Amino acid sequence: LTKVKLCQLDDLMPFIGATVLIEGERVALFYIPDSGVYAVQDWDPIGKAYVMSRGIVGDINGEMCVASPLYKQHFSLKSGQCLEDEAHCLKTWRVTVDDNQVCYLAKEL
């Protein structure tokens, strides 16, 4: 239920990936004006390189995804599922924006 300050919303350009680190893992933040902020692993599972922050965002049958800047596969920003290879999926992180504070939701105990 707890949230950890990640970055300021104006650190994020609309539709343009910003890399950040969440407890050691490479994460790509994508601010979508109408939707909020989505986080996905920055490492491209098919292409092998931290490069997802550099992928072009666009809409595909509605719900939008990010195209890897390497072998062009499309990955859903919400679920992480790759559209052209049901075998690949990007790791996701729950994210919220209160004032202009972008946080990620963690656990505890």
Q: Solving technique for this entry? A: X-ray
Q: Is 98 left (phi over 0), alpha (psi -120 to 50) or beta?
A: alpha
Is the separation of the CB atoms in 55 and 69 below 8 Å?
yes
For residue 107, what are the contacts with CB-CB under 8 A and spacing of at least 6? 2
Q: What is the resolution of this structure in A?
A: 2.4
Whether 7 and 96 have beta carbons less than 8 Å apart is answered as no
**C-alpha distances out from residue 88 to 37, 61, 79, 84, 107, Å:** 22, 19, 11, 9, 26
Q: Are 42 and 53 in contact (CB under 8 A)?
A: yes
| CATH superfamily entry for domain 1-109 | Rieske [2Fe-2S] iron-sulphur domain (2.102.10.10)
**Contact by Cβ (8 Å): 6, 109:** no
